[PDB]
Amino acid sequence: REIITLQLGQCGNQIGFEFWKQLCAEHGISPEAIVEEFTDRKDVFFYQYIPRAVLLRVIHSILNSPYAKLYGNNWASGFSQGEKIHEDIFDIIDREADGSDSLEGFVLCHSIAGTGSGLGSYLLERLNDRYPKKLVQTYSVFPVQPYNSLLTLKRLTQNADCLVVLDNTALNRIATDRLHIQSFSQINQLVSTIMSASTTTLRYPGYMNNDLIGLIASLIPTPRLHFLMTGYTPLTTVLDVMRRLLQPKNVMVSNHCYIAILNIIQGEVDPTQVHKSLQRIRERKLANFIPWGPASIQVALSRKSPYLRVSGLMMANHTSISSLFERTCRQYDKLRKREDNFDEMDTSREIVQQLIDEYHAATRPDYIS
Amino acid sequence: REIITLQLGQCGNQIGFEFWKQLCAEHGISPEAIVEEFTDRKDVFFYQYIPRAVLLRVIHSILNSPYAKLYGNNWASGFSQGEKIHEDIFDIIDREADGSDSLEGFVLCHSIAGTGSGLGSYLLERLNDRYPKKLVQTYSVFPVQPYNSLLTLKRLTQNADCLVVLDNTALNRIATDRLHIQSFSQINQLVSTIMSASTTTLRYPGYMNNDLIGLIASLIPTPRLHFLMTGYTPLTTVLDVMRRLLQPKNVMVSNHCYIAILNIIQGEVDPTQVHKSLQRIRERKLANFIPWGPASIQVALSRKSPYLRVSGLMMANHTSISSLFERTCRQYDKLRKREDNFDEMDTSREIVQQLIDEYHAATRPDYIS
Amino acid sequence: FEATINKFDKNFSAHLLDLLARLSIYSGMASVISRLDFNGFYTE
Amino acid sequence: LGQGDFIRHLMDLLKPELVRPATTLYQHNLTGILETAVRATNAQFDSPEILRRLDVRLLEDTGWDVFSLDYHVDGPIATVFTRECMSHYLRVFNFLWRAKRMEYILTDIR
Ligand SMILES: Nc1nc2c(ncn2[C@@H]2O[C@H](COP(=O)(O)OP(=O)(O)O)[C@@H](O)[C@H]2O)c(=O)[nH]1
Ligand SMILES: Nc1nc2c(ncn2[C@@H]2O[C@H](COP(=O)(O)OP(=O)(O)O)[C@@H](O)[C@H]2O)c(=O)[nH]1
Numbered sequence: 001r002e003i004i005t006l007q008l009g010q011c012g013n014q015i016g017f018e019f020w021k022q023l024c025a026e027h028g029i030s031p032e033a034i035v036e037e038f039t040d041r042k043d044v045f046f047y048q049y050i051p052r053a054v055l056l057r058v059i060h061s062i063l064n065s066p067y068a069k070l071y072g073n074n075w076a077s078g079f080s081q082g083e084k085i086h087e088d089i090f091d092i093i094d095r096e097a098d099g100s101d102s103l104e105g106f107v108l109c110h111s112i113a114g115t116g117s118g119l120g121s122y123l124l125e126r127l128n129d130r131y132p133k134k135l136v137q138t139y140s141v142f143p144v145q146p147y148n149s150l151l152t153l154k155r156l157t158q159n160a161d162c163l164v165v166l167d168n169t170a171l172n173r174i175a176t177d178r179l180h181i182q183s184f185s186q187i188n189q190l191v192s193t194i195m196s197a198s199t200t201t202l203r204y205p206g207y208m209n210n211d212l213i214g215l216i217a218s219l220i221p222t223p224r225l226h227f228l229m230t231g232y233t234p235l236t237t238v239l240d241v242m243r244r245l246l247q248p249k250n251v252m253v254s255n256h257c258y259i260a261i262l263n264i265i266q267g268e269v270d271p272t273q274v275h276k277s278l279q280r281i282r283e284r285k286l287a288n289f290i291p292w293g294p295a296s297i298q299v300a301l302s303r304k305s306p307y308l309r310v311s312g313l314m315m316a317n318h319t320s321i322s323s324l325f326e327r328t329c330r331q332y333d334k335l336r337k338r339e340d341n342f343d344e345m346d347t348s349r350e351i352v353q354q355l356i357d358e359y360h361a362a363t364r365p366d367y368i369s
Numbered sequence: 370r371e372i373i374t375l376q377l378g379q380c381g382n383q384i385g386f387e388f389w390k391q392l393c394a395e396h397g398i399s400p401e402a403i404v405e406e407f408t409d410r411k412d413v414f415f416y417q418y419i420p421r422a423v424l425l426r427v428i429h430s431i432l433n434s435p436y437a438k439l440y441g442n443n444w445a446s447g448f449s450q451g452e453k454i455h456e457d458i459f460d461i462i463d464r465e466a467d468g469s470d471s472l473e474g475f476v477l478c479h480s481i482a483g484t485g486s487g488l489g490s491y492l493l494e495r496l497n498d499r500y501p502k503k504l505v506q507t508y509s510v511f512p513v514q515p516y517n518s519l520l521t522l523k524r525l526t527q528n529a530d531c532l533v534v535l536d537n538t539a540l541n542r543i544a545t546d547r548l549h550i551q552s553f554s555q556i557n558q559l560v561s562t563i564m565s566a567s568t569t570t571l572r573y574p575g576y577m578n579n580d581l582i583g584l585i586a587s588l589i590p591t592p593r594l595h596f597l598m599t600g601y602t603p604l605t606t607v608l609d610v611m612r613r614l615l616q617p618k619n620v621m622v623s624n625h626c627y628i629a630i631l632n633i634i635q636g637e638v639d640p641t642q643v644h645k646s647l648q649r650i651r652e653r654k655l656a657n658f659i660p661w662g663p664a665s666i667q668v669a670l671s672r673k674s675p676y677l678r679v680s681g682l683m684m685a686n687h688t689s690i691s692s693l694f695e696r697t698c699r700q701y702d703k704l705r706k707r708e709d710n711f712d713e714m715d716t717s718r719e720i721v722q723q724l725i726d727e728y729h730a731a732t733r734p735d736y737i738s
Numbered sequence: 739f740e741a742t743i744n745k746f747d748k749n750f751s752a753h754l755l756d757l758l759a760r761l762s763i764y765s766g767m768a769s770v771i772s773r774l775d776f777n778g779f780y781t782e
Numbered sequence: 783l784g785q786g787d788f789i790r791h792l793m794d795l796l797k798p799e800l801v802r803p804a805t806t807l808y809q810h811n812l813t814g815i816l817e818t819a820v821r822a823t824n825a826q827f828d829s830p831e832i833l834r835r836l837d838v839r840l841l842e843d844t845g846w847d848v849f850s851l852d853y854h855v856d857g858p859i860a861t862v863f864t865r866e867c868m869s870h871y872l873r874v875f876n877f878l879w880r881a882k883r884m885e886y887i888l889t890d891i892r
Binding site: 039041043101102205206207208210211213214217 | 783784785786787790794822823824827888889892
Binding site for chain 3: 648651660662663664666
């Protein structure tokens with residue numbers, strides 16, 4: 001199985017280019033895309049080596065980089081121009097899909113704040129038209145900005161099969177808190193570490209989690225509640241890493257309860273004490289879970305790249321993510337009373353109201369029906 | 370069994386003159402027709418050493434070259450003058466035929482684009498009259514030009530028992546892509562590489578393919594589908610070479626499926642992983658064939674000349690060759706609506722339409738009947 | 739004549755299918771089948 | 783099943799075969815499929831000696847009830863396994879095969 005990545009807008013190209021640099025250095029791949037002498041299954045993200053990227057001014061600075069051998073602002077303006085080059089960009093994808101052995105999914109890296117955001121919303125719909133059996137995971141990044149943000153939300157709630165949220169307000173606070181930057185090329189260092197760590201169990205094979213659906217099938221309970229948040233602690237026993245991930249200071253998100261948790265421990269930790277820690281974390285009751293259906297916490301180990309110590313990443317599904325949509329929602333209404341049909345905004349405003357209504361009702365003892 | 374070759378027109382002379390130069394060096398033969406001291410069967414093309422060639426103002430360019438001791442624009446002008454010297458050039462071919470032990474074929478090198486077109490059309494007709502048991506292979510080269518081109522195709526579809534296409538257009542790309550020429554003196558260097566490596570199994574005897582009729586009857590299943598295209602990768606295991614031959618970037622051609630494939634591996638590669646690569650090519654499905662009849666792929670090894678590293682050539686019988694005809698067929702009707710019987714052109718027009726239909730019928734699961 | 743060519747077909751194709759039936763039933767002697775058919779033909 | 787990467791591809795290729803009843807199943811066909819999996823996955827970069835012993839066996843219904851790997855071992859190394867470890871691994875391999883198809887079913891439904 002293989003996973004084709006797409007990079008849209010200024011953000012997608014930058015965080016994708018930094019994702020590939022980190023992923024090339026994590027492996028034994030020279031900047032000239034040639035394997036150096038110096039186990040890690042790399043057929044999923046690299047093609048025999050060529051990355052399976054589809055990039056869409058910034059391209060020139062990439063081509064002037066040492067990695068050249070590795071390959072307006074409205075939403076309506078970003079939607080229309082994609083329609084006029086509909087056939088163009090798909091030929092690149094159609095040859096890469098059929099040239100691929102057995103396609104699995106489509107990773108999308110884009111910022112929803114505007115030509116790239118508009119182009120993304122267009123492409124997300126067409127992929128549902130052509131390929132019905134391919135997952136679409138989107139590494140969206142949150143910030144007329146309220147308008148564009150909610151429109152793409154209308155597509156991300158019914159088209160994208162999964163979604164991992166990364167908001168700049170939580171990342172910028174971290175850079176000033178634990179990095180003391182006072183830049184885009186600086187916070188992207190953290191975004192690259194989370195992205196590279198997200199697909200760790202795919203490149204280093206283990207007994208479990210050898211496919212992208214294996215990670216997603218546990219967290220997302222119903223096709224509607226497909227939003228996730230992240231947590232990265234080291235900015236050492238396994239009990240220490242678990243307790244530091246469940247603190248609010250580390251999450252990348254600005255009653256409520258958890259639906260499912262996945263922990264990625266990438267160190268050389270002792271794999272015999274991992275089952276012990278899950279016995280004791282349950283006793284302190286550090287996290288509150290859904291009352292309707294059963295839920296648990298998941299811990300998965302891996303191996304760090306020797307060519308480059310314990311780290312940790314936590315993928316969670318918390319209903320407190322509903323607050324982020326509320327801010328965009330409330331920000332939209334204030335502009336709607338202040339200034340060919342303007343009916344698409346009405347439908348998008350309505351459908352996101354149902355998503356928020358699902359979350360607040362997802363925390364009740366009778367979410368069934 | 371000896372093969373007497375013919376060269377017509379400026380093209381046939383230039384490719385043949387550079388074909389012999391590639392052969393004279395591949396053996397220990399000085400340009401003075403004298404063997405140099407410095408196992409390879411050399412009795413097919415050379416007569417004890419003199420090449421069996423019958424050429425027909427470029428001739429003076431050869432007589433001044435150091436190899437001197439080795440021997441209008443209308444299609445009607447070619448067919449007319451060829452009738453005036455019917456007895457002259459047939460005196461030479463006949464005296465060269467009986468002097469040989471047992472004639473086998475007539476490898477004829479001509480371009481269908483001035484006098485080589487009309488004269489070659491005359492020869493291929495006259496050979497089938499007197500010599501009814503002699504194979505006639507032709508290394509025709511593809512470029513009023515639409516007229517002279519298709520008229521030769523009328524004869525090449527019912528007289529020539531084989532045909533190897535080499536279009537200057539696709540060659541010019543490879544001249545530009547991987548050689549960066551912008552010239553005839555350069556593209557012919559690639560043509561001479563294809564012609565010489567085509568008969569590498571006749572001059573170097575191996576387990577099989579010790580006669581021209583062995584290379585012909587394997588690929589050409591029926592008397593009509595007798596058009597072949599070539600593929601030459603070196604411009605490392607057997608899997609490295611086999612994968613590169615099937616890429617459309619290497620074929621000298623500008624649903625669809627193969628009919629028969631023959632691979633020529635001129636390396637010193639061990640013959641134990643050969644079946645392994647063929648096993649792999651079936652798994653990944655890098656090429657498809659006809660559904661009606663049992664079509665298999667054949668691979669043949671040989672030995673490089675020590676007097677001169679892994680290479681590779683592929684003899685292909687692909688249905689996509691029908692595209693080159695349509696380009697000729699199309700431009701003809703346009704010239705037919707733009708301007709003693711003018712019936713030969715229309716009669717030739719009909720038989721080319723019968724051929725193209727036979728190709729597009731070859732890709733049907735009911736090609737029989 | 740025309741009734742004899744088709745007579746060889748039903749006779750030869752039946753004899754060939756007896757071969758791949760016995761060449762397959764074993765514990766190379768198995769890679770020979772991949773040499774006989776390559777297009778999935780003779781899948782009967 | 784400690785590899786995971788190889789058993790994933792091996793469960794995708796045996797799906798069209800094992801759905802049929804066992805009567806139409808013959809061992810000589812599956813070996814070409816197993817050999818294909820070992821070539822595609824990361825198990826290709828491996829010692830050729832140990833890959834010579836890894837084969838298939840047919841237990842004696844449906845194709846998901848008679849398939850199992852064997853990895854026969856004879857010689858001096860056979861004094862560590864002694865025909866009882868090979869009668870215990872297969873006793874284990876069933877429980878790891880069932881708990882592996884009961885999961886790839888539940889990720890197909892999802
Ligand atoms: N997280 C993150 N966001 C970025 C980065 N660069 C740009 N962005 C976002 O992208 C938005 C600007 O989009 P822009 O590039 O003007 O869109 P375009 O002009 O259509 O390509 C801003 O609101 C940022 O939040 C980055 O390096 N990291
Ligand atoms: N590939 C190749 N084709 C050639 C070369 N020289 C001539 N031709 C082809 O031959 C055609 C011209 O034929 P021409 O010399 O006029 O025939 P003539 O009237 O008998 O002399 C052109 O369309 C070219 O495509 C060569 O060196 N290489």
